[PDB]
């Protein structure tokens, strides 16, 4: 409904800077790693599938985790609890029908009690000072999709896929803002399917160019090439389904010609 499309995009651009997690945070965690984070996010993706949650809900939850972990040191035995509550909070924000608390307890295989989940919910709301309305890669892609001429469902679904893969690896994707990752993923998807490129219309909207996008784009391209070998595979599996036009089956381009 382009009467607020511009204002909204500007606003998200400002808010993504303020809601950004701290890039180096895992260095300062004594007992957890990037690779343990990779396992958490991958499981959250399955969780999202299991309960048919929105992708947006998945992106938010990750954002909540990364922000929470930017200031709170957490023991590995507790990382899955942080994640669970994060996903519950995201579900409550974003979902018409969030899963009820028991369900969240259940998908951990009764690892934590209902009381723990609810306490961690409260702790997370505190540490985040209730600031839950964070921009995601998903929110940017969705706007960028309006610039397709014409609309192509494979590109959309593929861009989603890629943006989703970026959630798994804090190194390097924590360095990049949602809007830039979305840019990269959009370009990469469009090029893979149609041969077309980041359109002039988005240069005007975003002020990003292939040049500004290159660093993230180089990374994301590697990630896309190496995706079948990645220790975490839930996202590839998820995007095999028809609902997403089987885009995880498409072959990545061997070169980007940049």
């Amino acid at each position: 409904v382009p009467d607020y499309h511009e204002d909204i995009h500007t606003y998200l651009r400002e808010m993504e800077v303020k809601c950004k997690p701290k890039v180096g945070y895992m260095k300062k965690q004594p007992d957890i790693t990037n690779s343990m984070r990779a396992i958490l996010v991958d499981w959250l993706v399955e969780v999202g599938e299991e309960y048919k949650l929105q992708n947006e809900t998945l992106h938010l939850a990750v954002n909540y985790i990364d922000r929470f972990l930017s200031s709170m040191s957490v023991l590995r035995g507790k990382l899955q609890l942080v994640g669970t509550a994060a996903m519950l909070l995201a579900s409550k924000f974003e979902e018409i029908y969030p899963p009820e608390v028991a369900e969240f307890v259940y998908i951990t295989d009764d690892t934590y009690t209902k009381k723990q989940v609810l306490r961690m919910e409260h702790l997370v709301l505190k540490v985040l000072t209730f600031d839950l309305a964070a921009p995601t890669v998903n929110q940017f892609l969705t706007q960028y999709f309006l610039h397709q001429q014409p609309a192509n469902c494979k590109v959309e679904s593929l861009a989603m896929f890629l943006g989703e893969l970026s959630l798994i690896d804090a190194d390097p994707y924590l360095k990049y803002l949602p809007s830039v990752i979305a840019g990269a993923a959009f370009h990469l998807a469009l090029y893979t399917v149609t041969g077309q490129s980041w359109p002039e219309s988005l240069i005007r909207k975003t002020g990003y160019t292939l040049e500004s996008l290159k660093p993230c784009l180089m990374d994301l391209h590697q990630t896309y090439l190496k995706a079948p070998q990645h220790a975490q595979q839930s996202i590839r599996e998820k995007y095999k389904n028809s609902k997403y036009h089987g885009v995880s089956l498409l072959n990545p381009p061997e070169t980007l010609n940049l």
Binding site: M36, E49, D109
Partner: peptide, 9 residues
């Protein structure tokens, strides 16, 4: 199964 306890070893 997605109902796993995560074992971070």
């Amino acid at each position: 199964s997605r109902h796993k306890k995560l074992m971070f070893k």
